[model samples]
Target: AMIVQRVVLNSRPGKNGNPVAENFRMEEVYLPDNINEGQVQVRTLYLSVDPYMRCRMNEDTGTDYITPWQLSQVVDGGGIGIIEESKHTNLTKGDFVTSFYWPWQTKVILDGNSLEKVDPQLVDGHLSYFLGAIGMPGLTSLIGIQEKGHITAGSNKTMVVSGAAGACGSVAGQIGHFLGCSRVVGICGTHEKCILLTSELGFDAAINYKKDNVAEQLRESCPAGVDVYFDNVGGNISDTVISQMNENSHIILCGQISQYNKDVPYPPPLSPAIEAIQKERNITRERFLVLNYKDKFEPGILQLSQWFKEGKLKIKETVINGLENMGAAFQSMMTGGNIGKQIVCISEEIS
Candidate 1:
């Protein structure tokens, strides 16, 4: 028998728009001898805290797009784990696997069908990468660009990304480079993040929204006009960029982190200026849902993993020490305290 600690929602959010530690509780659980055929008992390694998770905090019918996580239940998200015991014929006691539906417990009985086996060789000793870069975040950015961005090889298009230092934006900006965009620009909240976007992620240029004049900076950085806008943080930033987009530009609507905590999906009254800009330029805007390209996920993972192995891609993660601090980590990520990916490491041993 193993005693496990799992984080669960204790209270819902009020007007403040962020979850406090008081809103969450770490509950202790004990595993029983309930292993059955086609089941695997695994220890949680890392838990991913994403901005989009804020949607689950609301009391609605989960909106039309995604389901909400119920209160008093263990918060679930992408994670990697090591199997300790297995009754399934195809799985072994030492397999590493990933799941989108994992509980926050240190040990869990996972349905074999729900867990996907991973190759450590492909993961390259970065199990957390499976939760971030090569995982859902990376896939989200990659698929969005591949389909919605309408990128062409050596097309010399100008690309701009909001939330460029974040997991999805960082990947999307770098993907623009890989896809042969002539100029890649980023918009971030901090100067350090802007530096990282250009100095490390290969973005041609970047803007710090806190200090730089957003519209002026974007105009100067993308003089040729934006051809691909990968929007991770929508609102005014998007409005500014869209106004300067070239005709027939593409907008990959991957996320809206700035508005994740809001009650409405988009700002009230919408950005009429943005709508007019899109109308004049005939900009193509397509919101991305990774499930839309289910067929490409497996292959896309392989492609990203190859990029990592070949040193063509860079991975960055801001890690919180323990599962007990998962709520703090989630709130931090929502508040722009994380760069790249935000992961809660269950134990140092997993690294």
Candidate 2:
């Protein structure tokens, strides 16, 4: 038998309770050295922590798209690993693979077909990019804009992205620029994020929502008015954006990181004032799930990869070393403590 370490759910934080590191417990598990046919032994390399996982922390994830983690069961999500041994035809030893259901273990066995092989050249040696920039987050931004954003080139449209420094929002804001929004504005919690959005990510303007007056800053930044709003945070920030939106504008309901800790339904009920504004202005606030556009993921990823190669798409990541810190990394991400994608690296890379 081979010994392995895994992180499991120690307890649920309740629908309204905030998540913490203590909610996860690390434990040792053993796997038989012998693998069944079609199974492969793999060593974990990188794991992703995202805002949406907050819902999974609750007993009821509040959606049918994903299942909640059971108490004492291994927590799982997007992860990358290298195969140590394969009893499957499609995989060989040392080959890199990834899966959405990757368990939070230092080493584990999986069905080879459950994972997809990835190319290092696609990410330019950044294996972690499969979980972030050129992967789900990037695809979310690209498809969200194309489907719901109603962006028209040279239309003098102004685009605003809330939670603009985080994984999806960061990429969304940059996509607004590439898709030819006349003005791209970002709203984030910190001044550093505001600077990064404007200076590094090529956003036209940024608002430090924690310090600045959001309405006034938005007005100044987008004189043409917000024609497309990428709503990553649904709350007062969304209310402020909706109120100021132009006629027949669009809202790409990508995420609600701020409302995840609440017991409210997904997308949450907006304040009456915001709802009225949305109705009267004909604002299209459609919930955007990247998986809905699964047929287009290939093109979206290829476009994002092209942008990365051209140096037009700048990617940022906040990595916490070790599997022991998985819960902490997740907690930090939920609280907006991460500037970009939050990643947990458990082992070294493969050649």
Candidate 3:
């Protein structure tokens, strides 16, 4: 074995700002010539750059779901790659797989059981798809809509999604509409993104949060009130949506992208929203973790994949090419620059 190059964040800045291009540095390392009997070597293919990484880079001091990254260590999340060598009989060479491991890199050696083989047929469309729609983000959308949000047909429900143009939010909105919500409203950052949400993704209404008053726009679009709110960006946007919840509303707290870069010890509290949840309507707020639904994910993927094949569901990705741009891609996601999934194609010998 030999050493390979990897990307790592060099410093832990305060929470207020995201990791800049300077924060990340690429360096090479030596790999052992031979792996252990059960270990395998994986050549990196695609790496997912998500907003959650922003929180991971900061020092953890008892924040929920916050895990601090070790300095000088390769960061890992979700990635698709091919197995170069394997000691496990179940996994063989040339098998494409997905793994949740660290720092952006071209290759890794780990225990064979840590990686799951991916069907090549699934890789034909877009290699990054497995990292987004066909991967974690898709699973997140499914679990959020079906289980957490309790979406049902003929419920005459209205769905309002914050950060509607992003990866998970985009999928959640489309799934809500496919399940026949009376109206599906999306709040995005730009007018162009708003158009894409409604015109391209089948949302009933799209409101540009930067241009319009979210409370007024949502009230107008969802006149009957919101029955299900799929939230991604927490903060004022989430508060505004919660204020308009109908009787017995279900709120799926999917992600808080807006608060990822906060500098303070505690997020500016939304305690008033909790009071409203108790006073205004029978609202149930549930935070979703996709790993909990792994047992049911196959069925969810089947349903969404079928919808995609039938042209009822649309998939979009904002792909940044080359491993050198991984830091830029990650930064873009934190600042809401990418519309759909933010992915970096790790170009190396694996392809």
Candidate 4:
């Protein structure tokens, strides 16, 4: 048997309470050396903690698709690992794989079918990219835009992205530019994050939602009026964006991190004023779940990887070292302490 460390949900933070590191606990466990057939013993390399996990912390996730995390059980999400031993016919030792349901453990024995083998070269040897850009977040932004943004090449449209420095928002802004938006603008919380949007992500302009007059700044940034709004932090930010959007605009309801800590339903109901504006403007604010487009995943990954390889796409991630800090990383991500995709490195890559 081998000793390993794993994180578990120690307590639910309550529906209205904010999550903290104490809500999670790390424990040491033993794993048998021998594995069953079609199982793979893998060592975790990187783990992802996203805003969506905030709902899982409650007793009720308030969504049909997502299930709440059980108290005192191992926490799980997206992660990348290297195979140390395998009983499967197709997989072998030293191969790398990724899974959405990856456990928060340093080592684990999982069924081979649950994990998808990935090529390191696809991310240019930056294996962690598999958890961020060129992975789920990248695909979310790319497919969300393609399916909902309604872009017309050379139309001189303006695109705005809220929570623009985050995992999905950051990529969404850049993809809008590539998809023929004449101007791409980002709205984030911090001055530094705003800089990253304009300077690093190639956004035409960036607004600090906490500091600037959002309405005025948005008007200045999107003089032609917002044609596509990638709504990530839906709350007052979304309301503000919707108020200024052009008629027949699109709002890809990707996430609502601003309202995650609240007890309201998922994709929380819009305020009366915003609802009125939506009715008058004919803005399409449809909820987007990437899983619904299962058939498009393979093609989306190929397109994202191609963009990444050719330097057409820029990627950013904030990595915290050690599995022990997974809870802290998650808390930080929820509070907007991270600038890009928040990742926790559990172990170094063997290769």
Query: What are the RMSD figures for all models against the true structure?
Result: 1.9, 1.0, 2.5, 1.0
- Candidate 1 vs. true structure, TM-score: 0.95
Clashing pairs in 4: none
- Score candidate 3 by lDDT: 0.80
**Which TM-score value belongs to model 3?**
0.91
Question: What are the TM-scores, per candidate, against the unseen true structure?
Answer: 0.95, 0.98, 0.91, 0.98
Angstrom error of the Cα, residue 67, model 1: value is 2.3
What candidate 1 gets wrong by more than 4 Å, as runs, is: 14-16, 266-269, 348-351
Best-to-worst lDDT order: 4, 2, 1, 3
Model 2 error, position 308 (Å): 0.5
- Lowest summed-lDDT stretch of 10 residues in model 3? 264-273
**1 versus 2: better lDDT goes to:** 2
For residues 1-351, write the lDDT of model 2, one tens digit per residue.
878999999988999889999999999999888899999999999999888788888888877998898999999999999999999989999888999999999998898989999888989989999999899998998999999998878887899999899988899988898998988899999988888998899899999988999999988998878899999998889999988999999999999878888899887877888888889999988778888899999988899999999989999889999999999999988887889899999999565
Model 3 Cα lDDT, one tens digit per residue, 1-351: 577888877777776765786677788888778788888888888899887677788877336655777777777788988889888778888888887763477878888888777775653456678888777888898778888777778877899999899899899998897786878999999988998997799899999988998889988999998989998887888888988888778888788777777764433345775656736687888557777777888887777677777877788888888777877788787777888998888854664
Give the whole-model CA lDDT for all candidates, comma-separated. Answer: 0.84, 0.91, 0.80, 0.91
Residue 282 displacement in candidate 3 (angstroms): 2.0
Per-residue alpha-carbon lDDT of model 4 for 1-351, expressed as tens digits?
899999999999898999999999999999988899999999999999998899899888887988999998999999999999999988999999999999999999999999999999888988888888788888999999999999978988999999899999888998998889989999999999988888878999999999999999998888888989999999888989998999999998899988888898877888898899888989998889998998998898889899988888998999889999999999998888888899999999596
Q: Model 4: residues >4 Å from true position, as ranges?
A: 349-351
- Candidate 1 lDDT over 254-338, as tens digits, reads 8776666666644333367678878887998866788889999999999999888899899888999888898889888887888
lDDT of prediction 1:
0.84
Candidate closer to the true structure by lDDT (higher is better), 1 or 3 = 1
